[PDB]
Design a protein around this ligand. Sequence first.
Ligand SMILES: N[C@@H](CCC(=O)N[C@@H](CS)C(=O)NCC(=O)O)C(=O)O
Ligand SMILES: N[C@@H](CCC(=O)N[C@@H](CS)C(=O)NCC(=O)O)C(=O)O
Lengths: 183, 183
Amino acid sequence: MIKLYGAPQSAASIIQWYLEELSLPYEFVNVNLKEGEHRQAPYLAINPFGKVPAIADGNFHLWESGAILLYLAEKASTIPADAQARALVNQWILFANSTLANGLFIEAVREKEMPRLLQSLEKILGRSPFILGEKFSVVDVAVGSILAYVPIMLKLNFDDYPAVAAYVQGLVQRPAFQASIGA
Amino acid sequence: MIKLYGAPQSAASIIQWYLEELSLPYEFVNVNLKEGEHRQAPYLAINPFGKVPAIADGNFHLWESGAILLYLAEKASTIPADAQARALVNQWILFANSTLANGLFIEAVREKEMPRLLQSLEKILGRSPFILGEKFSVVDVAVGSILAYVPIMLKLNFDDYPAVAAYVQGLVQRPAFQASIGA
Ligand SMILES: N[C@@H](CCC(=O)N[C@@H](CS)C(=O)NCC(=O)O)C(=O)O
Ligand SMILES: N[C@@H](CCC(=O)N[C@@H](CS)C(=O)NCC(=O)O)C(=O)O
């Protein structure tokens, strides 16, 4: 089965949420970051950059939480997808991991970036229940996790963005979220 | 042909570098950031977050430099046709856009992050000419671009990482790099 390498307060929890949404079994392998287990040869053979999360699926190893989400989304796909459909999912995973995370969590750019990012998402989320439309997808796990860590880590809220706040509340109340990030 | 929306000193030159490597024509469209053209309705209809680069491939619109690089690579038939082969390229594009760019360019984490990132890249680049092995790929455009911007922006060099220095020097001399980022 999928082996997921993680640690507390890492993006491994985001992979755990998507694994809960897909109802896929997996092995959780804790990597002791406090004792530098991630900086030693066995873990460096899984991720040469010494970061969690990572997965092993047989002899296949994969790191970067975003690429793990896209990989799990592809393996669980029923209807074959083309380059454009994968590109729109990849666009949002890249966005969650760079533009969105940086704009919310980098103190020097937050005052400028964060209101703009939330204002743009407010328009999207005010027209559809989820990022890609009516149906929840891996994009909501990627963008939603970054947004949910805003109250958790920044002590900030989404009161000025009612549609963003309702979307984040809805994500937080999903049993798959409560069994993973919410635990 | 692809319409590429860019600006000087943006990641549009990275997309242009890859289009030149693929020998693909493109229509470059400048978005005047200094005059706020990226925050106007026509550009917001291409990228609702008002960032460059973005592409239009007929009626298909796509933003995030990383997703554009992955889409162009898929379209050009340079990645094998399976979820594992795509996940490995995705891993490197996400790494370039998040882990690598943050560790090199964010001052509060550079002291701890940069030597570890460069030491791991040095080991990889000491064993093969390019990140995936013998052949140049979109991974070299994504990772190599970030590395080439280290002297260009931070005034740092790779004197202590010989394989990284030689790799960057080789990338900067490629005709497609000179026709785009080097121009
Ligand atoms: N872009 C990466 C970031 C990974 C990352 O920053 N992981 C941290 C935990 S939050 C880590 O393993 N840090 C250990 C270290 O840098 O020594 C991802 O999304 O997977
Ligand atoms: N993660 C994005 C970053 C894009 C980005 O930050 N673009 C800048 C130019 S370097 C921009 O358009 N900034 C305009 C603004 O922030 O208003 C990507 O790689 O596409």
